[PDB]
Design a binder for this molecule. Structure first.
Ligand code: QMG
Length: 118
């Protein structure tokens, strides 16, 4: 039902989402709640979309998930003005998420994935 890589990606997801208690990054931003979003942000990302990419096996590496997570936070800091709650929340989430997605945890998880293979 899940490969070791999928299991590892799903666990990181849960860890990252716990750093978004406001649930602002849980779901895709739409043009209705953020006017002109689709004209400014060319590659949207959110936790629910990351969740489908894992289930659909779109990720070949943990680094890909980390890139998507950074994209999530980068999009929010580009679209939202610094005085907004969403900008501040993106900065807090980026800092907390990058500690979760440290080189040491990523390398540790990659070692485990290889040990569970073949
Ligand atoms: C990531 C980001 O840029 C973003 C996220 C949201 C958003 C807000 C709420 C919410 O609860 N809003 C009420 C507190 C006022 C719920 C879910 C989402 C996806 C948002 N809304 C407008 C502009 C930007 N954003």
């Amino acid at each position: 039902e899940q490969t070791p890589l999928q299991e590892a990606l799903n666990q990181l997801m849960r860890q990252l989402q716990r750093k978004d208690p406001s649930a602002f990054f849980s779901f895709p931003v739409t043009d209705f709640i953020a006017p002109g979003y689709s004209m400014i942000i060319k590659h949207p990302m959110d936790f629910s979309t990351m969740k489908e990419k894992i289930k659909n096996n779109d990720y070949q590496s943990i680094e890909e998930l980390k890139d998507n997570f950074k994209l999530m936070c980068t999009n929010a800091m580009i679209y939202n003005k610094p005085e907004t709650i969403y900008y501040k929340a993106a900065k807090k989430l980026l800092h907390s998420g990058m500690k979760i997605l440290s080189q040491e945890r990523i390398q540790s998880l990659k070692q485990s994935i290889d040990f569970m293979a073949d």
